[PDB]
């Protein structure tokens, strides 16, 4: 719907932030991928919070 759509991931697991730089997420949460350049991706959750989550708990979500 936009020329540059937002990219999303779905978490496979519950993950609890170990510090305030990481982002706690739940299994099946949908997360905006803000930065996937490293092993820890910066993502944003539905509440607008952002932080880092491990790449390996995330599955890419297909564009509509």
Partner 1 sequence: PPELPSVDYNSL
- State how far the alpha carbon of 19 is from the alpha carbons of 6, 16, 24, 41, 62, in Å: 26, 9, 9, 15, 30
> How far does the chain reach from its first CA to its final CA, in angstroms?
9
Among 7, 13, 17, 61, binds partner 1 (CB under 8 A): 13
Closest CB to partner 1 among residues 8, 55: 55
Region near partner 1 per CB under 8 A, out of 2-10, 24-32, 33-41: 33-41
Q: Coil, strand or helix: which one is 60?
A: strand
Note whether 24 binds partner 1 by CB under 8 A: no
Residues at the interface with partner 1 (CB under 8 A) = 13, 19, 21, 38-40, 42, 52, 54-57
């Amino acid at each position: 719907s936009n020329a540059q759509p937002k990219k999303y991931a779905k978490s496979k697991y519950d993950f609890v932030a170990r510090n305030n730089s990481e982002l706690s997420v739940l299994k099946d949460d949908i997360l905006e991928i803000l930065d996937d350049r490293k092993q820890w991706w910066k993502v944003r959750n539905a509440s607008g919070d952002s932080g880092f989550v491990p790449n390996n708990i995330l599955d890419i979500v297909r564009p509509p």
